[PDB]
Amino acid sequence: MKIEEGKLVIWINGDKGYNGLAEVGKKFEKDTGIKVTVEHPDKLEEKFPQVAATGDGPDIIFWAHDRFGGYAQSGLLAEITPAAAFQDKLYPFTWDAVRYNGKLIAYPIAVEALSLIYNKDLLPNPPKTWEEIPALDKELKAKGKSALMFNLQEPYFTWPLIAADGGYAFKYAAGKYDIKDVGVDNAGAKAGLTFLVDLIKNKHMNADTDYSIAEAAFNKGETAMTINGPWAWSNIDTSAVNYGVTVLPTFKGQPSKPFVGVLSAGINAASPNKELAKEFLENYLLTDEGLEAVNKDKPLGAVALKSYEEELAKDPRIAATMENAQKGEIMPNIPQMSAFWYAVRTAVINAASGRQTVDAALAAAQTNAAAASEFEKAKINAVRAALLENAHFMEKFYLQNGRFKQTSTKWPSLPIKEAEGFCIRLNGIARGALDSKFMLKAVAIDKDKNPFIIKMNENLVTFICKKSASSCSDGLDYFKGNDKDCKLFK
Ligand SMILES: OC[C@H]1O[C@H](O[C@H]2[C@H](O)[C@@H](O)[C@@H](O[C@H]3[C@H](O)[C@@H](O)[C@@H](O)O[C@@H]3CO)O[C@@H]2CO)[C@H](O)[C@@H](O)[C@@H]1O
Ligand code: NA
Ligand code: NA
Ligand code: NA
Ligand code: NA
Ligand code: NA
């Protein structure tokens, strides 16, 4: 159950250079005696918050930075505090990708963007526009080939087209990503997904194509182009394909806008090996030799470490990666990114299969992306459970005393005064309060992490309110005052 002291367990995705990373772990063990176990479990980014919530999981978790705000909201990550001399060794924008509510919550490793990858023997002059792909596919179909195959099961790969003409995830305004301003169903997003769906309708792509299908077709010379990231180049090198890496096609005259990911390494808040983890990441991995060992296994892309990036930048494939990154933008790291991705995944699959029109698929995704996160819903349920336990006490107290108040100016002391990061009190001053009614109110101790209050009456009718000035630190035994932006709990 508990993480073992005196060892490092690392999780990293199966498309990355995990054998190269294990070589870094071997060097760490030679120098320190500390064994390093690198694992690449399936769905590691979903497993981590499940097991880390209980104090389990790896010491170190690797993923793109977009997952990390959610992990931090759940209290799963240790704060990262590099010395200034170390911080200056990495590009500032990579630290900003892993900065959440003022704190660094991971070490940045590498900067990833998708590029267009093309077979130079089939296609010495690849297209500059998406619009010319249908004609090109027709020519290649006459030769027993196809123009383009890429993973249609993951929204990461289709997003650059959706974003090109105006799609966006969350608008950045007034100094934050605004989770109420989602750009998934505007005209530009609809234009881009419509074009992808048109390609499928016209048999230029097949809706069922996934990562392995598209990789095999490209690496076997059956399709002229694919869309993928630097991690994919290793398997192409093994193949007989002479490939180039270039800027993504434009759509309606505008660049495709890939979402740029920073592969990042966080430290589990429950790890008893935090100082060893920091030494591994700072002094072994984030060095020219450490990144090289990973890069030799599967290319990292551009790296966050300035010294090594100066070498990698001379590789034309890295120059092309950077060109596409410059036309995209950094993913937000905020907790809501999970809801955004799951929503767009379903939309693309549904529109591409014909199960829904583009308009209906994206209208649903727009709603789902802005809807209450899984964290918020779980928190509300868990806080409500604590309210129910206190309500049970209130009814026990009532039977014992004939009223809900202890005295005319004092409420009885509750059995569950804190739960799930909320303080819980009776709501309303006791003076003049009626004898056969009560209200319980739960307020967050950390109101940036849990920006809502929950209140419940004696018959368990519950409201969630997003605006309240109440504070758990005000030194009082009750709450008073009105809440705003309230909605019935169902
Ligand atoms: O689609 C469901 C999927 O949504 C979320 O996954 C997203 C990743 O969080 C995001 O980083 C990006 O993933 C790509 C990696 O950055 C890249 O290094 C490489 O591994 O390819 C990945 C894409 O397959 O985009 C995906 C969305 O496609 C969410 O975190 C997942 O739990 C969920 O399964
Ligand atoms: Na340091
Ligand atoms: Na910090
Ligand atoms: Na923000
Ligand atoms: Na690289
Ligand atoms: Na470039």
Residue numbers in the entry: 1 to 490
What wording appears in the published article?
DNA transformation is a widespread process allowing bacteria to capture free DNA by using filamentous nano-machines composed of type IV pilins. These proteins can act as DNA receptors as demonstrated by the finding that Neisseria meningitidis ComP minor pilin has intrinsic DNA-binding ability. ComP binds DNA better when it contains the DNA-uptake sequence (DUS) motif abundant in this species genome, playing a role in its trademark ability to selectively take up its own DNA. We show that they are structurally identical type IV pilins that pack readily into filament models and display a unique DD region delimited by two disulfide bonds.
To facilitate purification and crystallization, we used a synthetic comP gene, codon-optimized for expression in Escherichia coli, and fused the 115-aa-long soluble portion of ComP to an MBP modified to promote crystallization by surface entropy reduction (Moon et al., 2010). This soluble portion of ComP excludes the 6-aa-long leader peptide, which is processed by the dedicated prepilin peptidase PilD (Brown et al., 2010), and the first 28 residues of the mature protein, most of which correspond to the hydrophobic residues that form the protruding part (α1N) of N-terminal α1 helix in type IV pilins. After optimizing the best diffracting crystals, we collected a complete dataset on crystals formed in the spacegroup P212121, which diffracted to a resolution of 1.43 Å, and solved the structure of the fusion protein. As can be seen in Figure 3, the ComP moiety adopts the classical type IV pilin fold (Giltner et al., 2012) with the C-terminal part of the long α1 helix (α1C) packed against a β sheet of four antiparallel β strands. Subtle differences in ComP's conserved core include the lack of curvature in α1C (as previously observed for PilX) and the rather long loop (14 residues) connecting β1 and β2, the first two β strands of the β sheet. While ComP's α1β1 loop is an extended unstructured region, its D region is particularly striking. Unlike in (most) other type IV pilins, where one disulfide bond stabilizes the C terminus of the protein by stapling it to β4, in ComP the C terminus forms a long unstructured loop held in place across the face of the β sheet by two disulfide bonds between the four Cys residues in the protein (C76-C125 and C118-C139). The C118-C139 bond delimits the loop by stapling its C terminus back to β4 and is therefore equivalent to the single disulfide bond found in other pilins. In contrast, C76-C125 is unique and pins the middle of the loop back to β1. Finally, three of the last five residues of the protein form a short β strand (β5), which is incorporated into the β sheet.
